[PDB]
A paper describes a structure:
Isothermal titration calorimetry was used to measure the thermodynamics of the binding of 1 or 2 to EcGUS and BdGUS. In addition to a small negative enthalpy change (about –2 to –4 kcal mol−1), binding was contributed mainly by entropy (+4.6 kcal mol−1 for BdGUS in Tris buffer; +7.1 and +5.0 kcal mol−1 for EcGUS in Tris and phosphate buffer, respectively). With the aforementioned structural information, the differences between the thermodynamic parameters for 1 and 2 support the idea that the lack of H-bonded water molecules for 2 diminished the coordinated H-bond network, which disfavored binding and thus the observed enthalpy penalty (ΔΔH1–2 = +8.5 kcal mol−1 for BdGUS in Tris buffer; +6.2 and +5.5 kcal mol−1 for EcGUS in Tris and phosphate buffer, respectively). Furthermore, EcGUS contains a narrower aglycone-binding site than LgGUS and BdGUS. The alkyl substituent of the inhibitors therefore facilitated an increase in hydrophobic contacts with nonpolar residues of loops 3 and 5 in EcGUS, e.g., such as Leu361, Phe365 in loop 3, and Val446, Met447, and Phe448 in loop 5.
However, intestinal bacterial GUSs cleave the attached glucuronic acid for use as a carbon source, allowing potentially toxic compounds to re-enter the enterohepatic circulation.
Author numbering:
A (entry chain B): 1 to 195, 200 to 237, 245 to 366, 369 to 600
B (entry chain A): -2 to 366, 369 to 599
Amino acid sequence: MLRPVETPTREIKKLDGLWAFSLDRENCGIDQRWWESALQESRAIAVPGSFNDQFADADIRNYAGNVWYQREVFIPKGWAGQRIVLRFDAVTHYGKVWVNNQEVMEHQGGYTPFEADVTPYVIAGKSVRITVCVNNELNWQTIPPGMVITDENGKKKQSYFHDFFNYAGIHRSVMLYTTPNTWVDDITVVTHVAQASVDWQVVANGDVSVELRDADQQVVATGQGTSGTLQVVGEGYLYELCVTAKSQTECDIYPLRVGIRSVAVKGEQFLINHKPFYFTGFGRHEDADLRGKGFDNVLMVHDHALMDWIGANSYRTSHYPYAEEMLDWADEHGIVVIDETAAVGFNLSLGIGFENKPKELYSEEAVNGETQQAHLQAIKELIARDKNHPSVVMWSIANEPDTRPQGAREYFAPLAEATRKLDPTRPITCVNVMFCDAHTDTISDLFDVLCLNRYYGWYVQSGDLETAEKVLEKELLAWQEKLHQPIIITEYGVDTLAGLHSMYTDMWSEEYQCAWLDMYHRVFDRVSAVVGEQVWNFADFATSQGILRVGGNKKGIFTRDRKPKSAAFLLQKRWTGMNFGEKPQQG
Amino acid sequence: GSHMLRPVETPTREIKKLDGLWAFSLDRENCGIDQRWWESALQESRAIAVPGSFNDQFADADIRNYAGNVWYQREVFIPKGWAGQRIVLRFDAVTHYGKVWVNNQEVMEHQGGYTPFEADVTPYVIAGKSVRITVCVNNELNWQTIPPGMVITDENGKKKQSYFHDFFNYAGIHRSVMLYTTPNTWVDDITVVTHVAQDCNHASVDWQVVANGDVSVELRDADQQVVATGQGTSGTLQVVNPHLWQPGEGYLYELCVTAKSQTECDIYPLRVGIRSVAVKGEQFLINHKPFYFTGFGRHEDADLRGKGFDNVLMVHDHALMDWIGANSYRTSHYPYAEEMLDWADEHGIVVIDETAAVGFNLSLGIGFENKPKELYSEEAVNGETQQAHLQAIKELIARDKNHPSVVMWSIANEPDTRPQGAREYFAPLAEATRKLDPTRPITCVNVMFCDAHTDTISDLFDVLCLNRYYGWYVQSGDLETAEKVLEKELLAWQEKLHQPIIITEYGVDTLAGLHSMYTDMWSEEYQCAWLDMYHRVFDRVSAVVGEQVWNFADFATSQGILRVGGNKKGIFTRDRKPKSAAFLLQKRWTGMNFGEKPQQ
Ligand SMILES: CCC[C@@H]1NC[C@@H](O)[C@H](O)[C@H]1C(=O)O
Ligand SMILES: CCC[C@@H]1NC[C@@H](O)[C@H](O)[C@H]1C(=O)O
């Protein structure tokens, strides 16, 4: 499965915004089969957006259970001789959908599309009732995991183990799509460099021809057959190889953009086209002021303008798969992307407070075999749909897992190996949490380049930069000599509320963010193996409520409404001072 | 105005073209028209989101303050199952000036920044292939624009736009772009008007221009059960025993007009609410019952889209207004996105509909630095200006005529009526508006300094709308003098005109977080105290039938020593968080009985 693009392939975008929405507090929907009649006592909701914060209501915001969307649609008239298929680009956590009293789809996965042919349940020209049942619950076999808890009164409350807030709803595009009656499924392409080759595979209903055209889209070379190899002689050139499906009586044309993408890892260097690289940029989040994680074109354009100004050339889709629009953008603009799945919270050592969670991390009570297989499904879907993007430069299996407990490597080994089985073109990482240090972590052996999320001077060095530097440097050198891999610091940052200034350079002040980030920068400058720096969050984002979070995680370089803290000008001076992709040497 | 109805979905349809990502480029030296950029793909472009203002999408002050022409562009595949159908391309709002090319054929031109414009473009496309849409957008204001302004060119030829309204002059394609298909039998326009007597029964006269054929109509129920039927291009009266459109509820029948040609059919559903507005003495009646307006002057303004319409923003802002107890609002200083008038229609929100005629006043800006000396004059507000204004009223009424939520038209906001020729200007505009729609009252929002003994034009309008700021811009910080001045000025207006009085703006700048024990200006405590005193005075004047505090949220403005990052008069911050006064109003507005004036 890959993204619908239009040519003699058509669609009616159904991000019509306003659907009928209703909560299901007493779980009556399935039994009264609500999809059967117009929702009783509904309210208007926006459909590219989370349902949590759109109504300024704490009881919808913290709601756990089943919610219901509904929307009627007229199917276009020129589709009577076509297959009508219905695609949701992201339903966060779980979705099941009924096209007029007949059930059509079901899917467990919050950041990946799922589609299904409904041509035998539609006829072009008339109006059908679409009803969606969305679930936002997490158990130990979900990606990410969690524990629902039902109190004395029967009220559900969801507990989880990741920082960001558990936003849910229809966060991305809904889509009615038609394609000619022979070509259905997937295409895959792989690219090589010689210090200039390709490959093709199409799955459709008949003969296939493929022609690579360039940005002027004049044909630069053509083959036809499911496989073989053509050759050819800040932001990146994207050719376009146009694959055609000659068969039955109708032809089908699909355009797939390809970039000359190359890379594996070599010793201590993350090369690109046989070129050393330094990652600069951010751990991101899909989080905005009123839409939750809902995608929005304005926000995307503005935050790319911000990363462009600040000099970042890369980022990482922190803790879940992102809106594909962003990877198409990264394609055209030459942004380097670390693709991560929703597998966060595999750790019960991070929660901090005054408050019964399972005692053995890897076991049947928690992360079991079912968990490992749901995980492998998540990696499967992320690779299945982002495989042809040039901007995806590395896969990341999970984020900050607890690898101290027994059973950790028995769990993660088949996943690393299987993912290498899923695509050998790009490297494999697993971002490492602070407390599984160099002397302790179990799984770093299995990955190509190890990524570190370290916060010396914040969570563990009590605001004392002068010792934090020393600790961070030992640990740096230790990691490299233990694995002689490239080191990408994927998370590093401190909570700072915009407006707090202090002569004493204290924690939470803007001066402290500046000083802390630049001391980290000084040690980066001095160790061979660090090939990347991505600060911990570009903007402030929302989290669940707790004594550690003042209205959200304030570790951002920008505020939630995208206004710059002082450190935004620190980074801008450093990241645009170096030349592109090259690390500042030691002074 | 020219015939136009909202594109609604029947067995003939529309395909959304706000795909957001278009090619955008500014035209710094007007090379665009000369090289007719409309001919080839835009040279040196960057991605823009549509709909949204272009000013703040790139976090760059040099685009933000840019004056001149900008260029949007996008290819489109026209669906082929549309062959033998009329294809129309509608822009719902291109702010200030826009003209567009279907690759090389130019199709439309428009100077109104907040009202739609379309053109039948069936002979310039054929279904199945993809054509390039190129749009030229101008953000310049002169004295014949609505609103007016003065572009001024420095020594170097760079433009800088000067204007005389508070809010910032956002531009771009702010609303929906859209290709839509209709059968070759045209239902070009519909007009519906409602009457009632004692809530028991009456009728909805009707008129329709349907360019191509016979028309029958059926008014259907919320159950879509037929409750009456008509026949004819006009007349089309039927009588009912209905459940009529009321503020708290908003019951909407559906007028299904069908246009039978000899081979083609066309179906249009137009939602109607059975409401009757009028004014009698000092009372604003709705279904023959006095009404009390509560709520806000609003704005189309958010943190990164400028004035771009956004569904989440609409849903969340209605959630807040509903919580806070607001029952009404007015589309402050320009026509709003029709989505909002449909929302108000379905939910029973009462709306004062206003045109973009702000800044007809050179007495409001205050500072230390060349504006014309005669407001009404050939160099400034001129005859061309008056026809431009009459055109703006023509489009707004043409587009929001059948909405039950629209309860009153407002021609302009805070014009200076002191100079002679103010009444010469506004009188024919008031009379013309009255003939363009006799169903709803006519207002013209009154500025603080054209007081009751000074104003010239209020004679000409049905309901008096006051923007008062005693205690803020004058009597600054003194609640005891502001109360007296306000109360005698209110009583004065009542003695002079015996109209209903709606206080359509009253508010103070309040920094969220700034608290004070001394109840001084800019603190949240001052907002509460100030609004609260104003509320005692309203409660003590017979003729005041409405209160709309000045601004629901903080919004952006031009830069100046009076605007701290914008106008801070909102009850909510720009990111919709409530100041302390937000709970003051919530206590009042849900304490009173719905639609009733507090009895003191
Ligand atoms: C010491 C663990 C740090 C933690 N790392 C994972 C991110 O998802 C969180 O945002 C970050 C944080 O605490 O902000
Ligand atoms: C005395 C004029 C007040 C003025 N009235 C018009 C609004 O558009 C402005 O926002 C408001 C203000 O200055 O706050």
